[model samples]
Target: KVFGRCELAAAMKRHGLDNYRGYSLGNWVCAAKFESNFNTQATNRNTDGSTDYGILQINSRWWCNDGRTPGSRNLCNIPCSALLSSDITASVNCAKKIVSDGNGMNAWVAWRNRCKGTDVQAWIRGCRL
Candidate 1:
């Protein structure tokens, strides 16, 4: 994984993950930190037999395809494993789709619990956007 939020911030800026659909760079960075500590390969198996993928932790129960989760909606049309790469293009795109359809970044549980309504300046602090 990377060092801190700023390292991810630069990558996200290159991928246009910053401020996507009003998701501030800080929000994206913070969510990634809480979800996967910027480790792209991070995965969490859920009790429902579904899984979360990537640093953004997009869920198989609704968003991405993993095949492990039966009848998943696969609304993002992306394989969950695609997210576990140094290049996060697919992950960012899938996350955008989820945010566009759901309650913004509320699609990410990390955002709801950690990033939302908090003083998130440090997530972007000391980092040039």
Candidate 2:
């Protein structure tokens, strides 16, 4: 599913991303926008041979096991395929684990380059959530 900006904001907020780890909901929303544009099935392969999956673009290198990454810790304990579904539970949970593991939102380079230190609220403007 490709979510509108507000829709994505609401969904992420519902999943506990709002102010998660001191990062505002808008921060998460902004990252999601740059990472996958709210597309549930988005997949991006890195030059290092790892794949990023889902709306939040969780990586296969250390988060999800795609069975093809040279060495995958699969820290989320889920198949990368699980992140491609419209149900974002797995994706959100994995993201939380990533943040909790001390990476913060910087785990996504797109977030660091595009969303970090920007006006994050702009990403969720008009969203009632």
Best by lDDT: 2
Candidate 2's C-alpha lDDT?
Answer: 0.91
Q: How high is each candidate's TM-score?
A: 0.92, 0.97
Question: Candidate 1, residues 1-129: lDDT per residue as tens digits?
Answer: 543678788888888877788878888888899999889889999999999988888899998888889888898888888988878889888877888885898878878998998877678899977
Local distance difference test values of all predictions, in order: 0.85, 0.91
Q: Show model 1 residue runs off by greater than 4 Å.
A: 1-3
As a whole number from 0 to 100, the lDDT of residue 15 in candidate 2 is 89
Q: How close is candidate 2 to the true structure, as a TM-score?
A: 0.97
For 1-129, candidate 2 gives per-residue lDDT tens digits of: 998999888888898989889999898888888899889999999999999999999999999999999967899999999999998889999999998887788888999999899999888888887
Give candidate 2 regions above 4 Å deviation.
none
Q: Give me the displacement of residue 2 in model 1, in angstroms.
A: 3.9
Measured over all alpha carbons after superposition, the RMSD of each candidate to the real structure, in angstroms, is 1.3, 0.8
Clashes of each: 0, 0
> How well does candidate 1 score on lDDT at residue 91?
84
